[PDB]
Write a protein that binds this ligand. Structure first.
Ligand code: 7XP
Ligand code: SAH
Ligand code: MG
Length: 307
């Protein structure tokens, strides 16, 4: 089972982690097969070669944090490395649902896509709801005085702190908790790579939590959002005959009474039962004329392996 490994950033000093991060930045996500790159790709590596690359300091940092395991004559990693838009991010390997631990962290299914979708504005205070590996938070930290990442998965919170230290980022905070419970006051930016996919209304697990998690999210948005604030959400939406997602959403948001401008970009569509239709898209609340707008944009087909 994958996603249960111990993650302990507190067991390594910040300077060492930062320097590991700097070594990752050079080799992770490129074509050079260094020990480090191999390690964070799922390939076992020779510790003496790893030591050549990142030093005994680096080698010990990999082990003490849980990034690598000493299997005797080789090291392996439970984690996989990524380098996105200047940021290095470790997460779990992408594996089928049936072998995921309950504390499995989103292996960056959509994150590289989402960052390209995200508005390139900055501001005071950002919130990354369901931060998982921390990836969206790490990106937002460049632009915001302060970023708060929230997850109900304690392993995600630890992984987030690890990844922030690897990148030397210190204006980010990560908190374990349930949706908005640990998020006090208001935010100028809220990002939500929602745990919704094929489960419809049913709660399945942390990565497919059901439509009610969106209702909870959107019902609270008006009181968590600063004036002129921006909300961005990746989500699956179910339309049923006589019951479109957009109208339930409008009700949750109190869309008209709150003067929110909503724009939905629908990328993928699927047939579902009850004559329903499933869609995946990118939802943006941004300052502008009250109302909801939906447009077609097959950005999965277009980008996926691109910008
Ligand atoms: N935030 C995410 C959202 O981005 C989305 O992610 C999807 C991802 O889970 C799916 O992953 C499935 O297929 C993979 C093989 O391809 C299998 O290893 C996987 O365990 C399985 N799950 C992807 N194929 C498509 C993604 N959009 O739904 C889950 C939410 O928690
Ligand atoms: N009730 C809840 N409160 C806070 N986070 C939750 C939650 N239920 C599920 N989540 C989290 O929502 C995340 C969805 S996957 C998104 C992970 C990350 N932000 C990324 O883009 O890669 C998971 O990390 C899951 O643990
Ligand atoms: Mg699952």
């Amino acid at each position: 089972i994958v996603g249960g490994s111990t993650i302990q950033p507190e067991r390594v000093d910040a300077a060492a982690l930062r320097q590991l991060g700097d070594a990752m930045r050079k080799v992770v996500g490129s074509a050079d097969p260094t020990p480090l790159a191999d390690l964070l790709s799922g390939t076992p590596v020779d510790p003496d070669e790893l030591t050549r690359e990142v030093g005994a300091d680096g080698r010990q940092a990999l082990l003490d944090s849980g990034m690598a395991v000493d299997d005797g004559t080789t090291f392996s990693s439970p984690l996989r490395g990524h380098q996105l838009h200047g940021v290095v991010v470790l997460s779990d390997p992408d594996v089928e649902e049936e072998v995921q631990h309950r504390w499995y962290v989103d292996p960056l299914w959509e994150a590289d896509l989402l960052i390209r979708l995200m508005l390139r504005r900055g501001g005071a205070r950002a919130l990354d709801m369901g931060c998982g590996s921390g990836v969206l938070s790490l990106v937002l930290a460049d632009r915001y005085e302060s970023v708060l990442g929230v997850d109900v998965n304690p392993r995600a919170v630890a992984l987030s702190r690890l990844n922030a230290a690897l990148n030397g980022l210190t204006n980010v905070t990560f908190r374990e908790g349930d949706m908005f419970e640990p998020a006090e006051g208001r935010f100028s930016r809220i990002v939500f790579n929602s745990p919704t996919n094929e489960e419809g209304n049913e709660f399945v697990d942390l990565l497919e939590a059901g439509e009610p998690i969106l209702e909870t999210f959107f019902r609270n948005v008006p009181r968590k959002l600063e004036s002129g604030g921006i909300v961005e959400v990746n989500l699956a939406m179910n339309d049923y005959p006589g019951d479109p997602f957009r109208e339930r959403l409008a009700d949750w948001l109190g869309l008209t009474e709150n003067g929110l401008r909503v724009q939905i970009f629908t990328s993928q569509r699927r047939a579902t039962e009850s004559g329903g239709e499933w869609k995946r898209g990118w939802l943006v609340v941004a300052p502008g004329p009250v109302g909801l707008t939906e447009v077609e944009w097959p950005y999965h087909d277009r980008y996926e392996e691109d910008p």
